[PDB]
Ligand binder design. Structure first.
Ligand SMILES: CC(C)=CCC/C(C)=C/CC/C(C)=C/COP(=O)(O)OP(=O)(O)O
Ligand SMILES: [Co+2]
Ligand SMILES: [Co+2]
Ligand SMILES: [Co+2]
Ligand SMILES: [Zn+2]
Ligand SMILES: [Zn+2]
Ligand SMILES: [Zn+2]
Lengths: 158, 158, 158
C-alpha cells in the first residue's frame, strides 16, 4: 500500500532570531515568527506525513497554546510524526518540497537541508528533494512578508 | 494502477448564506460567493478526483454559465465526480486535504468533515485526512478575504 | 517503484510578447516576464519531474544568470527534464496540472495544451490532465498581476 500526503505552511518574517529552514541556519536579517523555532519547511513536511497517515495535523499534535513547544526544535516534531508513520508500518517512499520565498537565496543550503531530512527520516537522500522558487515579487512572499512551503510525500508499507 | 490528482480552489467571503465547508455548516458572519453552494473544500477534492482521472475540472463538468448548477450542493457534485472515477474502475486510495484560512476556526469541525467524506466516497475514514492551517495573517486568506483549499488524492484500480 | 513530484511556479505579466502557456499561444494583451519564454506551466511541470527524481529544480539546471537560456522555448527544458527521468529508468505514470489565473480564459486551450504534453512526454493523453481555476479576484492572481501553476506527477519505473 502506498499513501499520499500534502503539507502547506506559512510564517511571517520579523522575529529577531536565527532563520532555521529545514534544520539549517540560513543567514538573514531577521527570522520567522512562530511558537516553535519557526521552521516552516519542517512543519510543512510534518503535516504531509501526518496527512498521508490520516493523523490530522501539527496543530492537533503540537498546539501553540502549550508552552511545552515554545521555541522547540522542529526536528523533534518531524521525528515524532515520522515515528508515528513507522509505528503504523510505513516508511518513506519519496518526498518533494517547494520553498516559496523571495529571499534569502536557498541554493547554497539545499544539500545541507536534504541531509537533515535523510537523517531524520532514516532515508536515502535519493528519496528526498528540496526545491525553491520565488513568486517574482508578487503576493505576500514577493513582498518579503514571510515564507511559504509546499510538500508532498509518498509513504509505503514496510 | 495508481493515479494521483491535485485540486486547488478559492472563494471570497461575502454571500449572505450558510458557510458550508466539506459539507459541514461552520458558524460565521457570512458565507462564500460562488455559482454553486460555495463549498471550497469539496470543490478542491472534486478537482483532485477529476484530475487524477484526466477528466478535466469542475469548470467543465459543472459550468458557472449553467443554470442547472446554480446553488448546487457540492456533496452531490463530489459524488458525481467519484462516480465517474468508479465507472473507470478506480476507487479511493487515500485523500489528504489542506484548508488554508485565518477564520473561521476549523478544528472543532474536522471530524465531522472527515465523516462527510467517508459517507460520500463510501470509504473508510482511515483513508481520509482533513487539515487546516492559517497563513499567520498573510495574504488574502490571512486577511480573512476568503478561503483556499488544496487537496491531493491517490486513486487505485478496483 | 513509483515516485511523486510537486511543482510550483509564478511569473508576472508585463512583457510585450506572445503569452505561451503549456506550449500554446493564448491571446492576451501582454505576456509573462521571465528569462526563458516565460511558460509558467511547463516550468511547474518540469520542477515536478525533477522533484520526483530528486534532481533539484529548474533554477539549478537552467540558471537565469546564463544567457544560453534567454528566450528559450520551455519545451526544450521540459524535454531535458523528462529525458533525465527516462535515463534513470522512469516514465510518466500520470500528471495533473492546475493553472491558477483570473485571465485569460484557459478552457479553449486545454486540449491543445494536453497534446503538447502528450508529445513531449511521449505519453497517452489519458495520463495527462490540465485544469484551471481562478481565485475569485483575490490575491496577485485575482488582481491579474500574474499566473501561478501547481503540478503533481507520478513517475513509475519502466
Ligand atoms: C498562499 C497560498 C494559498 C499559496 C499556495 C500557492 C499559491 C501562491 C497559489 C496562487 C494563488 C494564490 C493563493 C495567490 C496568493 O496571493 P497573495 O495572498 O500572496 O496576495 P496578496 O497579499 O498580495 O493579496
Ligand atoms: Co501551519
Ligand atoms: Co475553482
Ligand atoms: Co520559478
Ligand atoms: Zn509552522
Ligand atoms: Zn469552487
Ligand atoms: Zn518559471
Amino acid at each position: 500500500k502506498i499513501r499520499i500526503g500534502h503539507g502547506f505552511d506559512v510564517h511571517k518574517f520579523g522575529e529577531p532570531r536565527p532563520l532555521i529552514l529545514c534544520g539549517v541556519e540560513v543567514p538573514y536579517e531577521t527570522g520567522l515568527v512562530a511558537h516553535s523555532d519557526g521552521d516552516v519547511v519542517l512543519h510543512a513536511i510534518s503535516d504531509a506525513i501526518l496527512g498521508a497517515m490520516a493523523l490530522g495535523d501539527i496543530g492537533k499534535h503540537f498546539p501553540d497554546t502549550d508552552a511545552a513547544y515554545k521555541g522547540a526544535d522542529s526536528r523533534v516534531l518531524l521525528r515524532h510524526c515520522y515515528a508515528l508513520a513507522k509505528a503504523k508500518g510505513f516508511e518513506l517512499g519519496n518526498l518533494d518540497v517547494t520553498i516559496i520565498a523571495q529571499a534569502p537565496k536557498m541554493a547554497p543550503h539545499i544539500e545541507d537541508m536534504r541531509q537533515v531530512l535523510a537523517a531524520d527520516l532514516n532515508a536515502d537522500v535519493a528519496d528526498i528533494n528540496v526545491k525553491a522558487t520565488t513568486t517574482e515579487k508578487l503576493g505576500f512572499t514577493g513582498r518579503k512578508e514571510g515564507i511559504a512551503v509546499e510538500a508532498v510525500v509518498l509513504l509505503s508499507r514496510q
